[model samples]
Target: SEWLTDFIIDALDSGRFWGVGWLDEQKRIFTVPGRNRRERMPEGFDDFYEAFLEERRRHGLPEIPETETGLGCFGRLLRTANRARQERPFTIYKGKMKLNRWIMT
Candidate 1:
């Protein structure tokens, strides 16, 4: 469904790749932190999850069954990064003095 696809893509854009964590007993998603290395979900994620699933059901789509590993988080990261790289404007640099630079093409 377009809604599901769009939701997932938006989540990836905000660096919240799925399947890299688990939902706790309280039904909240958790993942290891980058610095402190503790498990926690991103801010505003619970609200997003609730709405996402609600839309999924409204569209008669099945829920995601269980967390499985494959090209999940890493695949999304690569895709998102590659997209940003492609969309960046081409930059031209001058001599080693680094005086003049401009974006084009």
Candidate 2:
């Protein structure tokens, strides 16, 4: 039996990732589900963040920073109402939502 580390490189090239890292107006790093659009953080978001920091502290990562990085627009584009043919009516009209920018790291 033998082990090799060559596949690790391809793993990076062909990796699949779901969640996204974010920093809000307060410059708080949030781990949210789905692609790098503003999918809301899970219900226990604070706990999730705490776990992130704890693991980061144990590893080669730094704690969260306290400065703004980028414009906090994410998943802002939506389907046009007039072109919305297939969808039925349980409307979710909204003015604003908790906002954050995709982390650039």
Candidate 3:
């Protein structure tokens, strides 16, 4: 059916999306559907970032510390580090500056 095709074309025309590639009108070689488009990261990340921003707005910035004597800074650092580890299980810290060293060595 053309429903998916029509919807895709309309979405591409809206300019809200970066671009899309699929079969052409003549069923020839695959092509970009619109102008000013480029291969870009998926939009799911945008939603994820927005969710984090909303949470930060509600919670007032990811919990940074107020006093040098307080554990607030460490608490926030731990939470952020833990979240990142959970998201990227392959990520590791080895006493080094570069990420590739941890991955390779």
* Per-residue lDDT of candidate 3, residues 1-105 (tens digit): 233234334433443432222223333212221212223446642222233234445546554335431122322333454421112332222232111111110
Q: Which lDDT tens digits does candidate 2 get at residues 1-105?
A: 001112112221232222323223243323223223344444533332343344445555454456421121111211221211112221222222322222211
> What local distance difference test score does each model get?
0.35, 0.27, 0.29
TM-score sort, best first: 1, 2, 3
Number of colliding residue pairs in model 1: 0
Residue 23 of model 3, lDDT score: 26
Instruction: Give the per-residue lDDT digits (tens) of candidate 1, residues 5-92.
Output: 4554555346554222322324322221122222344564443344455655687866555682222332233345442111222222
Error of 2 at 44 (Å): 9.8
Q: Which residue runs of candidate 1 sit more than 4 Å off their true CA positions?
A: 14-38, 42-44, 47-51, 62-105
Candidate 1 TM-score versus the reference: 0.27
1 against 2, candidate with superior lDDT: 1
The lowest-lDDT stretch of 10 consecutive residues in candidate 3 is 96-105
